[PDB]
Amino acid sequence: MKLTIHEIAQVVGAKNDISIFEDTQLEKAEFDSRLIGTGDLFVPLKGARDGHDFIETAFENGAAVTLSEKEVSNHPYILVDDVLTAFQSLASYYLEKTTVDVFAVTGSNGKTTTKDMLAHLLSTRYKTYKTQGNYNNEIGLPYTVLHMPEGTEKLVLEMGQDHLGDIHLLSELARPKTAIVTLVGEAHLAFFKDRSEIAKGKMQIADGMASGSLLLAPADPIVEDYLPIDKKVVRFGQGAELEITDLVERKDSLTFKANFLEQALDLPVTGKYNATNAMIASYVALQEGVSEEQIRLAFQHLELTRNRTEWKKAANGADILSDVYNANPTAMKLILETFSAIPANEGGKKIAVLADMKELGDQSVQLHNQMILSLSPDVLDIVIFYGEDIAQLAQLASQMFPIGHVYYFKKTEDQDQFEDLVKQVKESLGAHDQILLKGSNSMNLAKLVESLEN
Ligand SMILES: N#Cc1c(NC(=O)c2cc(S(=O)(=O)N3CCOCC3)c(Cl)cc2Cl)sc2c1CCCC2
């Protein structure tokens, strides 16, 4: 990073002083103590557990200073009213100091997100950084900003939303030079009411943009009432300014033609939507000085993006929600608070399969028990646990939940009831159920998700 502790303190409105501390140039920002290095800035957030607990473990790992809502003593600390707010203001300031061009994209997808594609095309001419994984919310975006390599010219930021107004905040924080909305109306769409509202929240991606900035929005009418007034708006889709005039899909390949492009394009993936993503990403890449040739070559060696947590279905008509990455307690807690917000389907049955999260440290077991506060008997009908460190949590669940609503399957270097787990899961899994699957990845967890799909 390119910041110093007094700088940060000044930018954040430190309630303490800082003059008392060294005022040393910092290395990088981390909210995961387990990630801190020598000279890093520690940012304690409210997660599975409060981050403030880990402050000490932070300096032990190298922290040179720490944000904090309370006096730290005998340690360099910047005192603020709220650490997340402080973290966001700081990311915002870093954007102003850097003057990097920001490209906001909203709407993940699956195989190859617009975010990765666009970042990929920009990489052909510029030093470009992007949102890693799914770090696209009020914690992830700020984080992505601060981890931007020195000299970045193009920053592609993906922005997700759980509640209306989430994107408005992100737009205001990042101030995108250009923005893209891919949209689609969610089904059981938890926390959100209906398509129009999802579209309303996504169109907020424009709120923090300067007048005349380019914004790509789909042809779908669902966004009409939310269009910005003083922006350069380009519509994509059949009939719109930008459109796919021809498409061909192989078994694992794709070839399509975009009206504004004179040549065709090839992608190592299959999907009408991937084509559109590629197209809209191309348009923005073009506006930034990238040639159709450079673009054409780049799509030659794209790069698939490991599934991307979303719904799917097991040969049964089930609603499988397998959260792939982010194997940490906060992520689990969050995936739980969401999965348990989505009301049940037809019949109305809710199931969650939780497994061990490796590498949590000597605090692993305690961290798994913490999930108990995120498990409600009323909303979840069956919770199945698979592992070792998660056993104490299963025991807690068996006491808190009704008789018979919990299951536990062993998994150690001695024994592994993977056999019985699949058997049990398959048995409980009804054709109109929603099964949540979360836990560090493993050969078995993968086989299990497959026994459902097959
Ligand atoms: N409590 C807690 C812990 C962690 N929490 C997170 O790493 C964390 C994760 C997320 S996230 O994974 O859900 N989020 C990220 C960036 O944005 C997208 C997803 C968000 Cl929000 C906040 C946070 Cl504090 S890691 C870890 C512990 C306990 C001790 C052992 C290691």
CSV table of C-alpha atoms and ligand atoms in Angstrom, one decimal:
chain,number,residue,atom,x,y,z
A,1,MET,CA,0.0,0.0,0.0
A,2,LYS,CA,0.9,3.7,-0.2
A,3,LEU,CA,-0.2,5.1,3.2
A,4,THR,CA,1.2,6.1,6.6
A,5,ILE,CA,-0.5,5.7,10.0
A,6,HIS,CA,-0.9,9.5,10.6
A,7,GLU,CA,-2.2,9.8,7.1
A,8,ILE,CA,-4.9,7.2,7.8
A,9,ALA,CA,-5.6,8.7,11.2
A,10,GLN,CA,-6.2,12.1,9.6
A,11,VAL,CA,-8.3,10.7,6.8
A,12,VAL,CA,-10.4,8.7,9.3
A,13,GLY,CA,-10.9,11.4,11.9
A,14,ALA,CA,-9.0,9.6,14.7
A,15,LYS,CA,-10.6,10.3,18.1
A,16,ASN,CA,-7.3,9.7,19.8
A,17,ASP,CA,-4.3,11.5,18.5
A,18,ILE,CA,-1.5,9.5,16.8
A,19,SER,CA,1.2,12.1,17.4
A,20,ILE,CA,2.2,9.7,20.2
A,21,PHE,CA,2.9,7.0,17.7
A,22,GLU,CA,5.8,6.5,15.2
A,23,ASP,CA,3.8,7.4,12.1
A,24,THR,CA,5.2,4.6,10.0
A,25,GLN,CA,4.5,3.7,6.3
A,26,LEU,CA,2.2,0.7,6.3
A,27,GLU,CA,2.3,-2.6,4.3
A,28,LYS,CA,-1.2,-3.7,3.7
A,29,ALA,CA,-4.7,-3.9,5.3
A,30,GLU,CA,-6.3,-7.1,6.6
A,31,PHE,CA,-9.4,-7.9,8.7
A,32,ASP,CA,-8.3,-11.6,9.1
A,33,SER,CA,-5.7,-11.6,11.9
A,34,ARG,CA,-4.5,-14.9,10.4
A,35,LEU,CA,-3.4,-12.9,7.3
A,36,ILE,CA,-1.5,-10.0,9.0
A,37,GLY,CA,2.1,-9.6,8.1
A,38,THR,CA,4.9,-7.3,9.5
A,39,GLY,CA,3.8,-3.7,9.2
A,40,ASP,CA,0.2,-4.4,8.2
A,41,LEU,CA,-2.8,-2.4,9.3
A,42,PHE,CA,-5.3,-4.4,11.3
A,43,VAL,CA,-9.0,-3.7,10.7
A,44,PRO,CA,-11.2,-5.4,13.4
A,45,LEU,CA,-14.7,-6.1,12.1
A,46,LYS,CA,-17.9,-7.6,13.4
A,47,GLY,CA,-17.8,-11.2,12.1
A,48,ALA,CA,-18.5,-14.6,13.6
A,49,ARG,CA,-16.7,-13.0,16.5
A,50,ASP,CA,-15.7,-9.4,17.0
A,51,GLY,CA,-12.4,-8.6,15.3
A,52,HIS,CA,-11.3,-6.5,18.3
A,53,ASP,CA,-10.7,-9.8,20.2
A,54,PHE,CA,-7.9,-10.6,17.7
A,55,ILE,CA,-6.1,-7.3,17.9
A,56,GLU,CA,-3.4,-8.8,20.1
A,57,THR,CA,-3.0,-11.8,17.8
A,58,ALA,CA,-2.6,-9.2,15.1
A,59,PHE,CA,0.5,-7.4,16.4
A,60,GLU,CA,2.0,-10.8,17.3
A,61,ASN,CA,1.8,-11.4,13.6
A,62,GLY,CA,3.3,-8.0,12.6
A,63,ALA,CA,0.6,-5.4,12.8
A,64,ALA,CA,2.2,-1.9,12.9
A,65,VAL,CA,-1.1,-0.3,13.9
A,66,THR,CA,-4.8,-1.0,14.3
A,67,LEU,CA,-8.1,0.6,13.8
A,68,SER,CA,-10.3,0.3,16.8
A,69,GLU,CA,-13.4,1.5,18.6
A,70,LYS,CA,-11.6,1.5,21.9
A,71,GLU,CA,-8.3,2.4,23.5
A,72,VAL,CA,-5.7,-0.3,22.8
A,73,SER,CA,-2.7,0.8,25.0
A,74,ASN,CA,1.0,0.0,24.5
A,75,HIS,CA,0.1,-0.4,20.8
A,76,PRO,CA,-0.3,2.0,17.8
A,77,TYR,CA,-4.0,2.5,17.4
A,78,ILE,CA,-6.3,4.7,15.5
A,79,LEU,CA,-9.6,5.3,17.4
A,80,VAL,CA,-12.8,5.6,15.5
A,81,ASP,CA,-16.6,5.5,16.0
A,82,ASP,CA,-16.9,2.5,13.6
A,83,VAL,CA,-14.2,0.4,12.0
A,84,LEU,CA,-16.1,-0.6,8.9
A,85,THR,CA,-17.0,3.1,8.2
A,86,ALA,CA,-13.4,4.0,8.8
A,87,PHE,CA,-12.3,1.3,6.4
A,88,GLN,CA,-14.6,2.5,3.7
A,89,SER,CA,-13.6,6.2,4.1
A,90,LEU,CA,-10.1,5.0,3.8
A,91,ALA,CA,-10.7,3.0,0.6
A,92,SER,CA,-12.5,6.0,-0.8
A,93,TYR,CA,-9.6,8.3,0.0
A,94,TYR,CA,-7.1,5.8,-1.5
A,95,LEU,CA,-9.1,6.0,-4.7
A,96,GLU,CA,-8.8,9.8,-4.7
A,97,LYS,CA,-5.1,9.6,-4.0
A,98,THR,CA,-4.6,7.1,-6.7
A,99,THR,CA,-6.9,8.5,-9.4
A,100,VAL,CA,-7.2,5.0,-10.7
A,101,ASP,CA,-10.0,4.4,-13.2
A,102,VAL,CA,-12.8,2.4,-11.6
A,103,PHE,CA,-15.1,0.1,-13.5
A,104,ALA,CA,-18.1,-1.1,-11.6
A,105,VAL,CA,-19.9,-4.2,-12.6
A,106,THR,CA,-22.9,-5.6,-10.9
A,107,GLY,CA,-24.2,-9.1,-11.3
A,108,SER,CA,-22.0,-12.1,-11.0
A,109,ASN,CA,-23.2,-15.1,-13.1
A,110,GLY,CA,-21.4,-18.4,-13.3
A,111,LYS,CA,-18.8,-19.5,-15.8
A,112,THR,CA,-17.1,-16.2,-16.7
A,113,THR,CA,-18.4,-13.1,-15.0
A,114,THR,CA,-18.4,-9.8,-16.8
A,115,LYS,CA,-16.0,-8.6,-14.0
A,116,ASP,CA,-13.3,-11.2,-14.9
A,117,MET,CA,-13.8,-10.8,-18.7
A,118,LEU,CA,-13.6,-7.0,-18.6
A,119,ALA,CA,-10.6,-7.1,-16.3
A,120,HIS,CA,-9.0,-9.6,-18.7
A,121,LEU,CA,-9.5,-7.4,-21.7
A,122,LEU,CA,-8.1,-4.4,-19.9
A,123,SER,CA,-5.1,-6.4,-18.8
A,124,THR,CA,-3.9,-6.5,-22.5
A,125,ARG,CA,-3.0,-2.8,-22.4
A,126,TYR,CA,-3.0,-1.7,-18.7
A,127,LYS,CA,-2.0,-2.7,-15.3
A,128,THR,CA,-5.4,-3.8,-14.1
A,129,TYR,CA,-6.5,-5.2,-10.8
A,130,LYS,CA,-10.0,-6.6,-9.9
A,131,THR,CA,-12.3,-8.0,-7.3
A,132,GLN,CA,-10.9,-11.3,-6.1
A,133,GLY,CA,-13.4,-14.1,-5.6
A,134,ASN,CA,-16.7,-12.7,-4.4
A,135,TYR,CA,-15.3,-9.8,-2.4
A,136,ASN,CA,-18.0,-7.5,-3.7
A,137,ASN,CA,-19.8,-6.0,-0.7
A,138,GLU,CA,-19.3,-3.3,1.9
A,139,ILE,CA,-16.2,-5.2,3.2
A,140,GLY,CA,-14.9,-6.8,0.0
A,141,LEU,CA,-14.9,-3.8,-2.3
A,142,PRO,CA,-13.1,-1.6,0.3
A,143,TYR,CA,-10.6,-4.5,0.8
A,144,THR,CA,-10.1,-5.0,-3.0
A,145,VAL,CA,-9.3,-1.2,-3.3
A,146,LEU,CA,-6.6,-1.3,-0.6
A,147,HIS,CA,-5.0,-4.4,-2.0
A,148,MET,CA,-4.5,-2.8,-5.4
A,149,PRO,CA,-0.9,-3.3,-6.5
A,150,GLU,CA,1.2,-0.1,-6.8
A,151,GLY,CA,0.8,1.4,-10.3
A,152,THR,CA,-2.7,0.0,-11.1
A,153,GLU,CA,-4.3,1.8,-14.0
A,154,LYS,CA,-7.6,0.0,-14.3
A,155,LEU,CA,-9.6,-1.3,-11.3
A,156,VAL,CA,-12.6,-3.5,-12.0
A,157,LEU,CA,-14.9,-3.7,-9.0
A,158,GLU,CA,-17.8,-6.1,-8.9
A,159,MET,CA,-20.7,-4.9,-6.6
A,160,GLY,CA,-23.3,-7.3,-5.2
A,161,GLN,CA,-26.3,-6.5,-3.1
A,162,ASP,CA,-28.3,-8.3,-0.3
A,163,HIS,CA,-30.5,-5.4,0.6
A,164,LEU,CA,-31.8,-2.4,-1.4
A,165,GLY,CA,-29.3,0.4,-1.0
A,166,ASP,CA,-26.2,-1.8,-0.8
A,167,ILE,CA,-25.1,-0.8,-4.3
A,168,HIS,CA,-25.8,2.9,-3.7
A,169,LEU,CA,-23.3,2.9,-0.9
A,170,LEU,CA,-20.7,1.1,-3.0
A,171,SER,CA,-21.1,3.5,-5.9
A,172,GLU,CA,-20.7,6.5,-3.7
A,173,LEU,CA,-17.6,4.9,-2.2
A,174,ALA,CA,-15.9,3.9,-5.4
A,175,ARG,CA,-17.1,6.7,-7.9
A,176,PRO,CA,-16.9,4.5,-11.1
A,177,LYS,CA,-15.7,6.0,-14.3
A,178,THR,CA,-17.9,3.5,-16.1
A,179,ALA,CA,-20.5,0.9,-14.9
A,180,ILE,CA,-22.2,-2.2,-16.2
A,181,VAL,CA,-25.5,-3.8,-15.1
A,182,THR,CA,-26.2,-7.4,-16.4
A,183,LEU,CA,-29.2,-8.0,-14.2
A,184,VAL,CA,-31.7,-10.9,-14.1
A,185,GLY,CA,-34.7,-11.3,-11.8
A,186,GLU,CA,-34.0,-13.6,-8.8
A,187,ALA,CA,-36.6,-16.2,-7.9
A,188,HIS,CA,-36.9,-16.9,-4.1
A,189,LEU,CA,-34.8,-13.8,-3.9
A,190,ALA,CA,-34.2,-13.6,-0.1
A,191,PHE,CA,-34.2,-10.2,1.6
A,192,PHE,CA,-35.4,-8.7,-1.7
A,193,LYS,CA,-39.1,-8.3,-2.6
A,194,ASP,CA,-39.3,-8.7,-6.4
A,195,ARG,CA,-37.6,-8.1,-9.8
A,196,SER,CA,-38.3,-4.4,-10.0
A,197,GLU,CA,-36.7,-3.8,-6.6
A,198,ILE,CA,-33.6,-5.9,-7.5
A,199,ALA,CA,-33.3,-3.8,-10.7
A,200,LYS,CA,-33.8,-0.6,-8.6
A,201,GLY,CA,-30.9,-1.6,-6.3
A,202,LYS,CA,-28.7,-2.5,-9.3
A,203,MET,CA,-29.4,0.7,-11.1
A,204,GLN,CA,-28.0,2.5,-8.0
A,205,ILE,CA,-24.6,1.5,-9.5
A,206,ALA,CA,-24.9,4.9,-11.2
A,207,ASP,CA,-25.5,7.1,-8.1
A,208,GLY,CA,-21.8,7.8,-7.5
A,209,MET,CA,-20.9,8.4,-11.1
A,210,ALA,CA,-20.1,11.8,-12.7
A,211,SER,CA,-22.4,13.2,-15.4
A,212,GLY,CA,-21.8,11.8,-18.9
A,213,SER,CA,-20.2,8.6,-17.7
A,214,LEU,CA,-20.9,5.4,-19.6
A,215,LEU,CA,-23.4,3.0,-18.1
A,216,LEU,CA,-24.4,-0.2,-19.8
A,217,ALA,CA,-27.9,-1.5,-18.9
A,218,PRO,CA,-29.9,-4.3,-20.4
A,219,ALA,CA,-32.7,-3.8,-22.9
A,220,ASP,CA,-35.1,-5.4,-20.4
A,221,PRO,CA,-37.9,-2.8,-19.5
A,222,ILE,CA,-37.6,-3.7,-15.8
A,223,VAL,CA,-34.9,-1.0,-15.5
A,224,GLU,CA,-36.6,1.9,-17.3
A,225,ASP,CA,-38.0,3.7,-14.2
A,226,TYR,CA,-34.5,3.6,-12.6
A,227,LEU,CA,-32.4,4.9,-15.5
A,228,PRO,CA,-30.1,7.7,-14.4
A,229,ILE,CA,-30.8,11.1,-15.9
A,230,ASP,CA,-27.4,12.6,-16.6
A,231,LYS,CA,-25.4,9.6,-17.8
A,232,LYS,CA,-24.4,8.2,-21.1
A,233,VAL,CA,-26.6,5.1,-21.2
A,234,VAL,CA,-26.1,2.2,-23.7
A,235,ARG,CA,-28.6,-0.6,-23.9
A,236,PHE,CA,-27.7,-4.2,-24.9
A,237,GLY,CA,-29.8,-7.1,-26.0
A,238,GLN,CA,-32.0,-7.9,-29.0
A,239,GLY,CA,-33.2,-4.7,-30.6
A,240,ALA,CA,-30.9,-2.4,-28.6
A,241,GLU,CA,-27.9,-0.3,-29.5
A,242,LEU,CA,-25.6,-3.3,-28.8
A,243,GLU,CA,-26.7,-6.7,-29.8
A,244,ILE,CA,-25.6,-10.2,-30.7
A,245,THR,CA,-26.5,-10.8,-34.3
A,246,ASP,CA,-25.3,-14.4,-34.6
A,247,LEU,CA,-24.4,-17.2,-32.2
A,248,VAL,CA,-23.1,-20.8,-32.3
A,249,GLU,CA,-22.5,-23.1,-29.3
A,250,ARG,CA,-20.3,-26.2,-29.5
A,251,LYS,CA,-20.0,-28.7,-26.6
A,252,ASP,CA,-17.4,-26.7,-24.7
A,253,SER,CA,-16.9,-23.7,-27.0
A,254,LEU,CA,-18.8,-20.6,-28.3
A,255,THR,CA,-18.7,-18.4,-31.3
A,256,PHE,CA,-20.7,-15.2,-31.6
A,257,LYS,CA,-20.9,-11.9,-33.5
A,258,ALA,CA,-21.7,-8.5,-32.0
A,259,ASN,CA,-23.1,-5.8,-34.3
A,260,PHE,CA,-20.6,-3.2,-33.2
A,261,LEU,CA,-17.7,-5.6,-33.8
A,262,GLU,CA,-16.7,-6.3,-37.4
A,263,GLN,CA,-15.2,-9.7,-36.7
A,264,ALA,CA,-16.6,-12.7,-34.8
A,265,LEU,CA,-15.5,-13.8,-31.3
A,266,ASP,CA,-14.6,-17.1,-29.7
A,267,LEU,CA,-14.9,-18.1,-26.1
A,268,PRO,CA,-14.0,-21.4,-24.3
A,269,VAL,CA,-17.4,-21.5,-22.6
A,270,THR,CA,-21.1,-22.1,-23.5
A,271,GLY,CA,-23.9,-19.6,-22.9
A,272,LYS,CA,-26.1,-16.9,-24.5
A,273,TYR,CA,-25.4,-14.9,-21.3
A,274,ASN,CA,-21.6,-15.5,-21.5
A,275,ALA,CA,-21.7,-14.1,-25.0
A,276,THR,CA,-23.6,-11.0,-23.8
A,277,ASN,CA,-21.2,-10.6,-20.9
A,278,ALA,CA,-18.3,-10.9,-23.3
A,279,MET,CA,-19.9,-8.4,-25.6
A,280,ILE,CA,-20.6,-5.7,-23.0
A,281,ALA,CA,-17.2,-6.2,-21.6
A,282,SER,CA,-15.8,-5.8,-25.2
A,283,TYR,CA,-17.6,-2.4,-25.7
A,284,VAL,CA,-16.1,-1.0,-22.5
A,285,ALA,CA,-12.6,-2.4,-23.4
A,286,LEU,CA,-13.0,-0.7,-26.8
A,287,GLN,CA,-13.8,2.7,-25.2
A,288,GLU,CA,-10.6,2.3,-23.2
A,289,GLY,CA,-8.3,2.0,-26.1
A,290,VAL,CA,-8.2,-1.8,-26.5
A,291,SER,CA,-8.3,-3.1,-30.1
A,292,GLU,CA,-10.8,-5.6,-31.5
A,293,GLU,CA,-7.7,-7.6,-32.3
A,294,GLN,CA,-6.3,-7.4,-28.8
A,295,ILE,CA,-9.7,-8.4,-27.5
A,296,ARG,CA,-10.1,-11.2,-30.0
A,297,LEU,CA,-6.8,-12.7,-28.9
A,298,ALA,CA,-7.5,-12.3,-25.2
A,299,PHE,CA,-10.8,-14.3,-25.4
A,300,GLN,CA,-8.6,-17.0,-26.8
A,301,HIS,CA,-7.3,-17.9,-23.4
A,302,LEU,CA,-10.0,-16.5,-21.1
A,303,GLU,CA,-10.1,-18.5,-17.8
A,304,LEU,CA,-13.1,-20.2,-16.3
A,305,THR,CA,-14.1,-19.0,-12.8
A,306,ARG,CA,-14.6,-21.8,-10.3
A,307,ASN,CA,-18.4,-22.2,-10.3
A,308,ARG,CA,-19.3,-19.1,-8.2
A,309,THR,CA,-21.7,-19.9,-5.4
A,310,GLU,CA,-25.3,-19.9,-6.8
A,311,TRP,CA,-28.2,-22.2,-6.9
A,312,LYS,CA,-28.4,-25.4,-8.9
A,313,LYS,CA,-30.4,-28.6,-8.9
A,314,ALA,CA,-29.9,-32.3,-8.1
A,315,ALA,CA,-31.6,-34.8,-10.3
A,316,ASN,CA,-34.7,-34.6,-8.1
A,317,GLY,CA,-35.8,-31.0,-8.7
A,318,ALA,CA,-34.1,-29.9,-5.6
A,319,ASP,CA,-32.7,-26.4,-4.8
A,320,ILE,CA,-29.0,-27.1,-4.1
A,321,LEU,CA,-27.2,-24.1,-2.6
A,322,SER,CA,-23.5,-25.2,-2.4
A,323,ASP,CA,-21.3,-22.3,-1.1
A,324,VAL,CA,-18.0,-23.2,-2.6
A,325,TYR,CA,-15.4,-20.7,-1.3
A,326,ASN,CA,-14.9,-18.5,1.7
A,327,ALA,CA,-14.3,-21.3,4.3
A,328,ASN,CA,-14.3,-19.1,7.4
A,329,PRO,CA,-16.8,-18.6,10.3
A,330,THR,CA,-18.1,-15.2,9.2
A,331,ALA,CA,-18.8,-16.5,5.7
A,332,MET,CA,-20.6,-19.5,7.1
A,333,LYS,CA,-22.6,-17.3,9.5
A,334,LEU,CA,-23.5,-15.1,6.6
A,335,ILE,CA,-24.4,-17.9,4.2
A,336,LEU,CA,-26.6,-19.2,7.0
A,337,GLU,CA,-28.4,-15.9,7.7
A,338,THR,CA,-29.2,-15.7,4.0
A,339,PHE,CA,-30.2,-19.3,3.4
A,340,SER,CA,-32.5,-19.1,6.3
A,341,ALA,CA,-34.1,-15.9,5.0
A,342,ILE,CA,-35.3,-17.5,1.8
A,343,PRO,CA,-38.7,-19.0,2.6
A,344,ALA,CA,-39.2,-22.6,1.7
A,345,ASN,CA,-40.5,-23.9,-1.7
A,346,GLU,CA,-43.7,-25.8,-2.5
A,347,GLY,CA,-43.8,-28.5,0.3
A,348,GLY,CA,-41.8,-26.2,2.5
A,349,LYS,CA,-38.7,-28.0,3.8
A,350,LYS,CA,-35.3,-26.5,4.8
A,351,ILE,CA,-32.1,-28.5,5.2
A,352,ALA,CA,-28.5,-27.5,5.9
A,353,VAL,CA,-25.4,-29.7,5.6
A,354,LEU,CA,-22.5,-28.2,7.5
A,355,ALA,CA,-18.9,-29.6,7.4
A,356,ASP,CA,-15.6,-28.7,8.9
A,357,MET,CA,-13.8,-25.5,8.0
A,358,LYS,CA,-10.1,-26.4,7.9
A,359,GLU,CA,-7.2,-24.1,8.9
A,360,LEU,CA,-9.1,-22.0,11.5
A,361,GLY,CA,-6.2,-22.4,13.9
A,362,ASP,CA,-6.2,-23.6,17.4
A,363,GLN,CA,-9.5,-21.9,17.8
A,364,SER,CA,-11.2,-24.0,15.2
A,365,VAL,CA,-13.6,-26.0,17.4
A,366,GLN,CA,-14.7,-22.9,19.4
A,367,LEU,CA,-15.4,-21.1,16.1
A,368,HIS,CA,-17.6,-23.9,14.9
A,369,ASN,CA,-19.6,-23.8,18.1
A,370,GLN,CA,-20.2,-20.1,17.5
A,371,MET,CA,-22.3,-21.1,14.5
A,372,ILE,CA,-24.9,-22.3,17.0
A,373,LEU,CA,-26.1,-18.7,17.3
A,374,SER,CA,-26.9,-18.7,13.6
A,375,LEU,CA,-29.0,-21.9,13.7
A,376,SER,CA,-32.7,-21.6,14.4
A,377,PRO,CA,-34.9,-24.6,15.0
A,378,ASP,CA,-37.9,-22.7,13.7
A,379,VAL,CA,-36.4,-21.9,10.2
A,380,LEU,CA,-34.2,-25.0,9.7
A,381,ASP,CA,-35.9,-28.4,9.7
A,382,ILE,CA,-32.8,-30.6,9.5
A,383,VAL,CA,-29.2,-29.8,10.0
A,384,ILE,CA,-26.6,-32.4,9.1
A,385,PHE,CA,-23.0,-32.2,10.3
A,386,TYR,CA,-20.0,-33.9,8.7
A,387,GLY,CA,-16.6,-33.8,10.2
A,388,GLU,CA,-14.5,-33.7,13.4
A,389,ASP,CA,-14.1,-30.2,14.7
A,390,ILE,CA,-17.8,-29.6,14.0
A,391,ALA,CA,-18.9,-32.4,16.4
A,392,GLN,CA,-19.3,-30.1,19.4
A,393,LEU,CA,-21.6,-27.9,17.3
A,394,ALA,CA,-23.7,-30.9,16.3
A,395,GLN,CA,-24.1,-31.8,20.0
A,396,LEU,CA,-25.2,-28.2,20.7
A,397,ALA,CA,-27.6,-28.4,17.7
A,398,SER,CA,-29.1,-31.7,19.0
A,399,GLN,CA,-29.9,-30.0,22.4
A,400,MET,CA,-31.3,-26.8,20.8
A,401,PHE,CA,-33.3,-28.5,18.1
A,402,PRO,CA,-36.3,-30.8,18.2
A,403,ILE,CA,-35.8,-34.6,18.7
A,404,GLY,CA,-34.5,-36.1,15.4
A,405,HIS,CA,-33.9,-32.9,13.5
A,406,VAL,CA,-30.1,-33.2,13.6
A,407,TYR,CA,-27.6,-35.7,12.2
A,408,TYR,CA,-23.8,-36.1,12.6
A,409,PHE,CA,-21.4,-38.1,10.5
A,410,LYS,CA,-17.8,-38.7,11.6
A,411,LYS,CA,-14.8,-37.8,9.4
A,412,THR,CA,-11.3,-38.3,10.8
A,413,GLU,CA,-8.1,-40.0,9.8
A,414,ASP,CA,-9.4,-43.2,11.5
A,415,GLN,CA,-13.0,-43.4,10.2
A,416,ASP,CA,-15.2,-41.6,7.7
A,417,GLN,CA,-18.9,-42.2,7.5
A,418,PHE,CA,-19.1,-40.5,4.1
A,419,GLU,CA,-21.0,-43.5,3.0
A,420,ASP,CA,-23.8,-42.9,5.6
A,421,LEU,CA,-23.9,-39.2,5.0
A,422,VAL,CA,-24.7,-39.5,1.3
A,423,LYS,CA,-27.3,-42.2,2.2
A,424,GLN,CA,-28.9,-39.9,4.9
A,425,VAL,CA,-28.7,-36.8,2.8
A,426,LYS,CA,-30.3,-38.5,-0.2
A,427,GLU,CA,-33.0,-39.9,2.1
A,428,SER,CA,-34.0,-36.6,3.8
A,429,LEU,CA,-33.7,-34.7,0.5
A,430,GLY,CA,-37.2,-34.3,-0.8
A,431,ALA,CA,-37.9,-33.2,-4.4
A,432,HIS,CA,-39.2,-29.8,-3.2
A,433,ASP,CA,-36.5,-29.1,-0.6
A,434,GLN,CA,-33.7,-26.6,-0.3
A,435,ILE,CA,-30.4,-28.0,0.9
A,436,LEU,CA,-27.5,-25.7,1.9
A,437,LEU,CA,-24.1,-27.2,1.6
A,438,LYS,CA,-21.2,-25.3,3.3
A,439,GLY,CA,-17.7,-26.2,4.5
A,440,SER,CA,-14.1,-26.3,3.5
A,441,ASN,CA,-13.8,-28.0,0.2
A,442,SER,CA,-12.9,-31.7,0.3
A,443,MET,CA,-12.9,-34.7,-2.0
A,444,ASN,CA,-15.9,-36.1,-0.1
A,445,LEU,CA,-17.9,-32.9,0.0
A,446,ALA,CA,-17.5,-32.8,-3.8
A,447,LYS,CA,-18.5,-36.4,-4.2
A,448,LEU,CA,-21.6,-35.7,-2.1
A,449,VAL,CA,-22.7,-32.7,-4.2
A,450,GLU,CA,-22.3,-35.0,-7.2
A,451,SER,CA,-24.5,-37.8,-5.7
A,452,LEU,CA,-27.2,-35.2,-5.5
A,453,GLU,CA,-26.7,-33.8,-9.1
A,454,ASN,CA,-26.3,-37.3,-10.8
B,1,LIG,N1,-14.9,-14.1,13.1
B,1,LIG,C1,-14.1,-14.5,12.4
B,1,LIG,C2,-13.0,-14.9,11.5
B,1,LIG,C3,-12.9,-14.6,10.2
B,1,LIG,N2,-13.8,-13.7,9.6
B,1,LIG,C4,-13.5,-13.3,8.3
B,1,LIG,O1,-12.5,-13.7,7.6
B,1,LIG,C5,-14.5,-12.4,7.6
B,1,LIG,C6,-15.1,-12.9,6.4
B,1,LIG,C7,-16.1,-12.2,5.8
B,1,LIG,S1,-16.7,-12.9,4.2
B,1,LIG,O2,-16.0,-14.0,3.8
B,1,LIG,O3,-18.1,-13.2,4.4
B,1,LIG,N3,-16.6,-11.6,3.0
B,1,LIG,C8,-15.2,-11.2,2.8
B,1,LIG,C9,-15.1,-10.1,1.7
B,1,LIG,O4,-16.4,-9.8,1.1
B,1,LIG,C10,-17.1,-11.0,0.6
B,1,LIG,C11,-17.2,-12.1,1.7
B,1,LIG,C12,-16.5,-10.9,6.3
B,1,LIG,CL1,-17.7,-10.0,5.4
B,1,LIG,C13,-16.0,-10.4,7.5
B,1,LIG,C14,-15.0,-11.2,8.2
B,1,LIG,CL2,-14.3,-10.5,9.7
B,1,LIG,S2,-11.5,-15.4,9.6
B,1,LIG,C15,-11.0,-16.2,11.0
B,1,LIG,C16,-11.9,-15.9,12.0
B,1,LIG,C17,-11.9,-16.4,13.4
B,1,LIG,C18,-10.4,-16.9,13.8
B,1,LIG,C19,-9.8,-17.8,12.7
B,1,LIG,C20,-9.8,-17.2,11.3
